[PDB]
Amino acid sequence: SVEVYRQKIEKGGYSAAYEATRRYEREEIEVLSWSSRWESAWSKFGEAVKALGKIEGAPRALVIAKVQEALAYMSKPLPNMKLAMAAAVQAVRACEQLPGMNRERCLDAVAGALGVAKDWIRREMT
Amino acid sequence: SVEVYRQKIEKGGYSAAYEATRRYEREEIEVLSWSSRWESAWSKFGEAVKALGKIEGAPRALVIAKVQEALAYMSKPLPNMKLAMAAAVQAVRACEQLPGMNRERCLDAVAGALGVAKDWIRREMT
Amino acid sequence: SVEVYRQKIEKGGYSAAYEATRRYEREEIEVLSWSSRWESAWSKFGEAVKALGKIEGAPRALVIAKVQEALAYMSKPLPNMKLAMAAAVQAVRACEQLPGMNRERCLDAVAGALGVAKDWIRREMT
Amino acid sequence: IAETLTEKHTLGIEKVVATDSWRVGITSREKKLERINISAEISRRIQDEAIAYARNKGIPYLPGINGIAWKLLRLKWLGYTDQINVVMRTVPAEWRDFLTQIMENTQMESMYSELRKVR
Amino acid sequence: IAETLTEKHTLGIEKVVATDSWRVGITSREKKLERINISAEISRRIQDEAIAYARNKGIPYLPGINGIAWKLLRLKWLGYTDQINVVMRTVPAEWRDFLTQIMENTQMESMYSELRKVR
Amino acid sequence: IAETLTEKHTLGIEKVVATDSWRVGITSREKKLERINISAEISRRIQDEAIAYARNKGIPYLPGINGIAWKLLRLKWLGYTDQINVVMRTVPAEWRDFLTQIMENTQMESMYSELRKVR
């Protein structure tokens, strides 16, 4: 709808984004403490998605999403490696439908991104 | 419901939490005295629930809750070891129904977290 | 329309563009950080279009647009060489329609501007 | 500057007293608050039975058997049955018949009132 | 001066609190907000069955099995079936029939409600 | 003093934030803005079919296939047809029929809506 569009345009975001930029360059604004807690937790999720570079072809969003879902279970204070393998085998089965990808080459990329052995994902496939 | 949602939205929580974060960094807020009494008392409950890490499988909330309930009785000014053992055997029975866990392997994780002998929970099982 | 024309005239664009030039010459305006992020990312697209200079003849907008579209897929954080070749074979087939241009002279210019081998674009032609 | 759990607890409180989220947190529900009426109802009903039990058998009234008979009532609803077995060994002998009187024998009255409260 | 991702995240937040876009982001939609009502409806319709399943079979109520059965309802709606089969091996034995009860046996009530929520 | 392409980009922005030409650039058009309403329509129509196509053939729903089906719709409108043939080799096999379902089988509904948008 354009009614939700017009209510955000009239708030003046183009000018306010330009003006807050100038305050940063004039050293009047420091880095927020939410941003410091953000990049400490997120940086492990950013490099694993870039390790899915050698998967080629179609919309690769489901392979990318289910790897991020698999790391999230491993990174808890009480990591659940059973439910982490649940989302991982969906990423392998979503990967092998793309043209050019074998099942073993999808087991290469996902286990290389997650940083675990390839036999753990092979077990739950059956 | 949405009407219970709206009355907390219009109070401006995203803006006001940003201003409290800035005031802490500008040394205008000291640590409240309630938080010092909280972290002094809570910290024994936080390291003990992380010792249930090697319990694997299903929703593990019932193992986590009945272990946290068991430490509450031991940490009283007058500790009740009989009512503490009542909640511990519910944690052991809730642990062993998970796939992969044994009766004996749950007796390590519960008694290791509580810091007691394994025979104290074995006596009350019957 | 003139109604959209008149509303942007009355804001005084000729005067304020003159005034902002003077502030730059009187050292009161620095380079915006949006500009430094722009020239670092765009500069690969600027010199590649100048490498299409030896294509002669007709409206050459379709050759230029689909080559800039082809570089966009190669320059992603996860580069998709399959979809990049999809736009390039359209730029090649658009190129060969012009008078004076052959099919092999067009594979010279497009594969030279993208900086890849000529045999890659030959495969998806068929 | 700093972000640890002592200061996360503090800055979560400072935003509450700023925007007045506590008193609007109570007054905006107005539907959960009838549970305080029902909880005070079952509270009296267990207490009156404990004194009537104490004068029929001539035993002294044991304070705190109201709470023991209530915790056993709530775990009976959930199903934590081996927790019930250890508390029944913990209470004295003459009061064990009172605790099963709250769970089983007043299944009609008291166990319904918890079923309306959690609803 | 600087342009990195920690500063890109900050200057996005500083722009929002300047122009007050968060509260007008919610109060301008007002049609998407009814999804919270339909979400809280299925939330209770799963939870009440989990306790009725707990007392028909005499097993204790396992908290979080209402959370597991809500995830499997949504993946069934999308079609991530091999995701389901590994989760079904993870839960205990007496609760596997409850999870397929949330998916299959209440296909009328609960599966239509997710179909109306995403519309 | 200086005139390069970096500070040409800057001095174009500084006269925008001075005259306030961005907000009057949108609010003076007010006829082109209903293209957002039609673009929000065809996105919904493609997405609803992609889930229904996913449950008739038992396959998981593949996200981003609503994006690919919309790009191939607009290139069919212009006529970039050798662009289409390489993208059809790129997608998986069971989803090729859905892509030619958007271009061919719903030409009466969806291809008219793009035809009414560019007008």
Residue numbers in the entry:
A (entry chain a), B (entry chain c), C (entry chain b): 2 to 127
D (entry chain C), E (entry chain A), F (entry chain B): 10 to 128
Please share text taken word for word from the publication where this structure appeared.
Tristromaviruses, which build enveloped filamentous virions and infect hyperthermophilic neutrophiles of the order Thermoproteales, represent one such enigmatic virus families. A cryo-electron microscopic reconstruction of the tristromavirus Pyrobaculum filamentous virus 2 at 3.4 Å resolution shows that the virion is constructed from two paralogous major capsid proteins (MCP) which transform the linear dsDNA genome of the virus into A-form by tightly wrapping around it. Unexpectedly, the two MCP are homologous to the capsid proteins of other filamentous archaeal viruses, uncovering a deep evolutionary relationship within the archaeal virosphere. Our results uncover an evolutionary relationship among three families of hyperthermophilic archaeal viruses, Tristromaviridae, Rudiviridae and Lipothrixviridae, including the homology of the MCPs and the similar compaction of the genomes as A-form DNA by these MCPs.
To study the virion organization of tristromaviruses, we have determined the structure of the Pyrobaculum filamentous virus 2 (PFV2) at 3.4 Å resolution. Cryo-electron micrographs show the membrane-enveloped virions of PFV2 to be ∼340 Å in diameter and ∼5,000 Å in length. The helical symmetry was determined to be a rise of 2.86 Å and a rotation of 22.95° per asymmetric unit, where the asymmetric unit contained a protein heterodimer and 12 bp (base pairs) of A-form DNA. The DNA, almost completely covered by the heterodimers, tightly supercoils in a solenoidal fashion with one right-handed supercoil per 45.4 Å turn of the capsid helix. The native twist of the DNA is therefore 11.3 bp/turn (564 bp in forty-seven local turns plus three supercoil turns). There was no ambiguity in fitting the sequences of MCP1 and MCP2 into the density map given the resolution achieved. While a 3D superposition of MCP1 and MCP2 shows significant differences in the overall folds, a flexible secondary structure alignment reveals a one-to-one mapping of local secondary structure elements indicative of obvious homology. Notably, PFV2 achieves a similar coverage of A-DNA as SIRV2 and AFV1 by swapping the upper half of the MCP1 N-terminal helix-arm to the other side of the MCP2 helix-arm. In contrast, this spacing is ∼30 Å in PFV2 suggesting that the lipids are arranged in a similar manner as in the host membrane, perhaps stabilized by VP3. Due to the shared virion organization, we suggest unifying Tristromaviridae and the order Ligamenvirales within a class ‘Tokiviricetes’ (toki means ‘thread’ in Georgian and viricetes is an official suffix for a virus class), the first class-rank taxon for archaeal viruses.
